């Protein structure tokens, strides 16, 4: 298959596949069944901010998701990503809807990765930030239903003209350039990502969520990965 490391903002409890009974954030290492989760209050129609942070020294993948009123949830998981991810990856955002739906609107996304080594701050680095997306965002690989629009946003999943999110949708956006996420001779490999998002739904139980993910460079939406699989995984194993 792909190799996926992800931080999921999971809006819809799929308890039959190990989701906690409440919306949650989670750290997913090669499985949709998060290695760690934290209860998350998704604030319908509010703009949230997710931060993901890791460095190869601490070997701890951390995420926090917050809303302007100060509510937040955080999850951290100890993992040496050198032993999980390929050396070269692509980084992306994914989202899905299913029977129930929600907008999976990304308003901004930044990412920074650095590899530092042996001597001085002699280093390879990648940093990108999108605080606006354009209709033809050539440095994004859009997959599935993901679109960017003149409205400055990245709609990961289908939204109708009337602004209504659609079910059975899956979409991703990957940064165009592969990222050298680790290297054997790198003394420190660190990355951080931030994205802001607006999940809004008229469904009493919106679904399915948004994820920041890191994958093999040729990662594509696995078949049948709408709904609970968040566009990341081919199955719920
Ligand atoms: C009830 O289970 C479906 O919906 C939830 C909420 O969206 C998903 O988490 C779950 O994966 C299921 O989605 C599948 O089935 C939906 C129809 O029942 C379909 O719309 C989805 O695209 C997906 O196949
Ligand atoms: Ca879920
Ligand atoms: Mn989950």
Swiss-Prot record:
Spell out the SUPFAM superfamilies in the cross-references. Answer: Concanavalin A-like lectins/glucanases
Sorted alphabetically, which InterPro entries does this protein's record hold?
A: ConA-like_dom_sf, Lectin_LegA_CS, Lectin_legB_Mn/Ca_BS, Legume_lectin_dom, Leguminous_Lectin
Q: Which PROSITE patterns match?
A: LECTIN_LEGUME_ALPHA, LECTIN_LEGUME_BETA
Q: Which residues bind Mn(2+)?
A: 8, 10, 19, 24
**Segments crossing the lipid bilayer:** none
Q: Which keywords does UniProt give here?
A: Calcium, Lectin, Manganese, Mannose-binding, Metal-binding
Residues annotated as binding Ca(2+): 10, 12, 14, 19, 208
GO MF, one example = D-mannose binding
Is Membrane set as a keyword in this record? no
Where a carbohydrate binds, per the record, is at 12, 99-100, 228
The record's comment on protein family reads:
Belongs to the leguminous lectin family.
Q: What else is known?
A: Binds one manganese (or another transition metal) ion and one calcium ion. The metal ions are essential for the saccharide-binding and cell-agglutinating activities.
Q: What does this protein do?
A: Glucose/D-mannose specific lectin.
Q: How does it assemble?
A: Homotetramer.
Its recorded name reads Concanavalin-Ma
Q: Which species does this protein come from? A: Canavalia rosea
